[PDB]
Amino acid sequence: XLXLXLXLXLXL
Helix, strand or coil, X not given: CEEXXXXXXXXX
C-alpha cells in the first residue's frame, strides 16, 4: 500500500 502497489507494481 506504500511504494509496493502504490507506485511499484500497482500504480506503475
